[PDB]
Design a protein around this nucleic acid. Sequence first.
RNA 1: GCCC
RNA 2: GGGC
Length: 205
Amino acid sequence: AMDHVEFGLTYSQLMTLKDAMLQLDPNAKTWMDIEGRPEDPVEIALYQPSSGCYIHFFREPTDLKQFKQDAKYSHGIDVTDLFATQPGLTSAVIDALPRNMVITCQGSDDIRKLLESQGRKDIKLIDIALSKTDSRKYENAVWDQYKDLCHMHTGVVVEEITPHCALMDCIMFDAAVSGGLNTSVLRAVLPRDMVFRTSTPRVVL
RNA sequence: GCCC
RNA sequence: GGGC
Ligand SMILES: [Zn+2]
């Protein structure tokens, strides 16, 4: 190619991001989960139960055909709802993760591919490797409490089942390991205007 | 339906 | 079996 662009984000936004990420404790238990393929992710979440802090954002898919298919069987995201997303956020957030961080997931193959494709092979991964029943014991309880935190899974998902959300997954997997869900308010690490296009034009031109 |  |  003749295209040579290092970042998707401006330096200003990269600096805001770096500051925001200081809310992450480099040594606290940290869950990570994605929806979409590791080579073409559409939803990313990281969650630290110790503080209630979470990182949550979206990305428009490159493979629209595979996406519409994945939506039917897993995430139920409509692609039009992913238009206002910030390009480059996935790379920027992953680049900003502390060196040699320990990340917990269920399971690890997709997480590993994504992080390694970003040159983070320094990140250590713990796979909880739970069954399909044990990992989703608190599925209803989590959605009951935290549904307002993600409005993106509007499509009917079949195998009809509850849609898979990267954020709800992190919270419910933690609940499974902790043997309970304790009721508490969570805190978004990223500013809203970093995650979505937020401008409202006065007039169309 | 697709991936491991 | 696990995952989208
Ligand atoms: Zn979600």
